[PDB]
């Protein structure tokens, strides 16, 4: 029983739906997440919708409020779970 | 005496109501929380309303802005308190 | 000279007014805070308006976005300052 | 070239303008900041518009979302930079 | 397939577009970012649109919600990636 059932889910709102992501590498994600909760620290590579990609030296349990289209598997050493 | 009494409580707003959660395991929570304050670090498993679940390797005092329907007891080693 | 003087102060907005809290124990706070900045790490107990209370094993300098009515003195080892 | 040029700058919005603060001690700040980025960890004292002041045992790189009128120099050991 | 495609991207919203920044030093950035994700810890210098600049002793993986016009190369030891 949620008292916030009638409330709309914005981008700023907490994570309603979560799904673990795989480093898919040139196949885009099913749904692009609002944020990424990292499970294991390391490096992971992220691509925008505009196509430019950088490597993120991420830590262990950080949330990073980025909205990626595709996570590639070349430099990805870090496992994450998407939030949406 | 709150000066913010007339203000509406959104999802982005601070925690008005808190209740400790138990790892219920196939019985859903009474009220689903806006966020989870973790008490003791460890692992805990969380299920959405869509049913998919992942394990979260959470730390000690982190808040995680996820909105879970049910916390299962299979892989839950971490005690948390819900915020709503 | 604030350029944000005409802006309304919501719950999501930064801390305008701060006051140090004492673990009052069955006398409610003067004004309930939007958030609590902790000064010294430890444990502290917090009561809602609905009456249920839990112990929070809080760390040293964390802010916790909870909106408590009364901070009791039974299990409170941690000093905090309220934000409003 | 900002794509967010037409957007209004709220209190919740990121830091547009930054200026380093000095512990002025009974002369108020030029502009009161939305938040304080701390440069060097230590203690610093902050006064509201209502006049009450507390000491904050702050850490090194923390941002603290407080909106102070004057930073005094009595107990201030920590250097910070204001955000607005 | 984003379910938040129709939603507008505010300043408070997560990072849609990311690009790595270079310490350009008296040539302004192409697009000013909403936030800066730091890659390697150190010091970096940031200039507003009003022109005043300070040095930030930043840590390794921190996001700092500042909106800089130009990152100079005099005191910049830290590599960052912009978010927008």
């Amino acid at each position: 029983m949620d008292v916030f059932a009638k409330h709309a889910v914005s981008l700023e709102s907490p994570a309603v739906r979560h799904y673990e992501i795989t480093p898919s590498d040139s196949t885009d994600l099913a749904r692009r997440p609002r944020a990424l909760r990292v499970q294991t620290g390391g490096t992971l590579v992220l691509r925008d919708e505009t196509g430019i990609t950088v490597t993120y030296t991420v830590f262990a349990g950080e949330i990073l409020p980025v909205r990626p289209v595709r996570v590639l598997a070349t430099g990805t050493t870090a496992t994450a779970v998407g939030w949406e | 005496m709150d000066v913010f009494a007339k203000h509406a409580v959104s999802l982005e707003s601070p925690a008005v109501r808190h209740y400790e959660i138990t790892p219920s395991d196939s019985t859903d929570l009474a009220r689903r929380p806006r966020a989870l304050r973790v008490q003791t670090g460890g692992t805990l498993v969380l299920r959405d309303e869509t049913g998919i679940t992942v394990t979260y390797t959470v730390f000690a005092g982190e808040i995680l802005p996820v909105r879970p329907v049910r916390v299962l007891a299979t892989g839950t080693t971490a005690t948390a308190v819900g915020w709503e | 000279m604030d350029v944000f003087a005409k802006h309304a102060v919501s719950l999501e907005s930064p801390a305008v007014r701060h006051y140090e809290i004492t673990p009052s124990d069955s006398t409610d706070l003067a004004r309930r805070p939007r958030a609590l900045r902790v000064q010294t790490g430890g444990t502290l107990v917090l009561r809602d308006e609905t009456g249920i209370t839990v112990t929070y094993t809080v760390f040293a300098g964390e802010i916790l976005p909870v909106r408590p009515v009364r901070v009791l003195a039974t299990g409170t080892t941690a000093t905090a300052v309220g934000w409003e | 070239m900002d794509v967010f040029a037409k957007h209004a700058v709220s209190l919740e919005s990121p830091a547009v303008r930054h200026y380093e603060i000095t512990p002025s001690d009974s002369t108020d700040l030029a502009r009161r900041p939305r938040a304080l980025r701390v440069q060097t960890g230590g203690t610093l004292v902050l006064r509201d518009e209502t006049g009450i002041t507390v000491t904050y045992t702050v850490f090194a790189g923390e941002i603290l979302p407080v909106r102070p009128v004057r930073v005094l120099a009595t107990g201030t050991t920590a250097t910070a930079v204001g955000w607005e | 397939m984003d379910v938040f495609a129709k939603h507008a991207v505010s300043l408070e919203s997560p990072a849609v577009r990311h690009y790595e920044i270079t310490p350009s030093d008296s040539t302004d950035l192409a697009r000013r970012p909403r936030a800066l994700r730091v890659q390697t810890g150190g010091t970096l210098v940031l200039r507003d649109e009003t022109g005043i600049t300070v040095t930030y002793t930043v840590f390794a993986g921190e996001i700092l919600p500042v909106r800089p016009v130009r990152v100079l190369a005099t005191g910049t030891t830290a590599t960052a990636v912009g978010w927008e």
Binding site: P14, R34, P65 | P14, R34, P65 | E12, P65 | - | E12, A15
Partner: peptide
């Protein structure tokens, strides 16, 4: 920046 619980940028 401020006191929300929101997974957000600022």
């Amino acid at each position: 920046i401020a006191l929300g619980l929101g997974l957000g940028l600022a």
